[PDB]
Design a protein around this nucleic acid. Structure first.
Lengths: 115, 51, 49
RNA sequence: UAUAUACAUAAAGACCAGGC
């Protein structure tokens, strides 16, 4: 009777922003992103792309609680590199990876069939 | 003393009429016999039946 | 392998098919909440059950 | 046009079974 709807995990209702950016006062150049209606699929890709960036000192995510679906990503970069720039370059670098993987998987298919 | 209706509520049965608490029966058995004891002493004053 | 992060789990885990029973006891029938409801006749206190 | 349909009733007790 209290079971939440199945669709409630990936669907946003009125008023919920997808992303919420809040600066972090503990630290200089630290920012904390809040992603609604996402899980470890999306959060883990980005964290692991941020740690390749040598100008990123810290990156990590957590699901605060499993029953509510949101991600919280802290990022701390070096001075004169903004933590919002770090998080955008991460997303464009995956897109430039996954667009290279979808093209290389199509070539191996045609090679595989009758070849 | 006869405690009030609150202390011995009736039972309202939607099927048939009402039922009465234990006290209301236990108090009925006293008023019956107390009254039989009213008449004997007042009328015949029969000594051995009163006992 | 870990399900969330993909990495192996250091210690090896013991898996096998095992036979479980579901019990007459479910949470939907044990749940209860009370705010200013029915009240007993004699005591004017909340009902039982 | 105005005004109205406002809540109460399913008793109690007994034994039996189970839960922690």
């Amino acid at each position: 009777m209290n079971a939440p709807p199945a669709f409630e995990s990936f669907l946003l209702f009125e008023g919920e922003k997808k992303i919420t950016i809040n600066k972090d006062t503990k630290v200089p150049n630290a920012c904390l992103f809040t992603i609604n209606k996402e899980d470890h699929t999306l959060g883990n890709i980005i964290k692991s792309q941020l740690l390749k960036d040598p100008q990123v000192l810290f990156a990590g995510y957590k699901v605060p609680h499993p029953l509510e679906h949101k991600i919280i990503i802290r990022v701390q970069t070096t001075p004169d590199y903004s933590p919002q720039e770090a998080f955008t370059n991460a997303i464009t670098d995956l897109i430039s990876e996954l667009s290279l993987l979808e093209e290389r998987f199509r070539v191996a298919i045609k090679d595989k069939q009758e070849g | 003393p006869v405690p009030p209706l609150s202390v011995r509520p009736a039972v309202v049965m939607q099927g048939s009429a009402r039922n009465q608490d234990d006290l209301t029966h236990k108090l009925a058995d006293i008023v019956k016999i107390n009254n039989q004891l009213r008449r004997n002493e007042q009328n015949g004053a029969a000594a051995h039946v009163i006992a | 392998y870990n399900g969330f992060t993909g990495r192996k789990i250091t210690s090896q885990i013991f898996i096998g098919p095992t036979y479980y029973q579901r019990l007459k006891h479910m949470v939907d029938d044990k749940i209860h909440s009370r705010a200013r409801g029915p009240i007993q006749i004699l005591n004017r206190q909340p009902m039982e059950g």
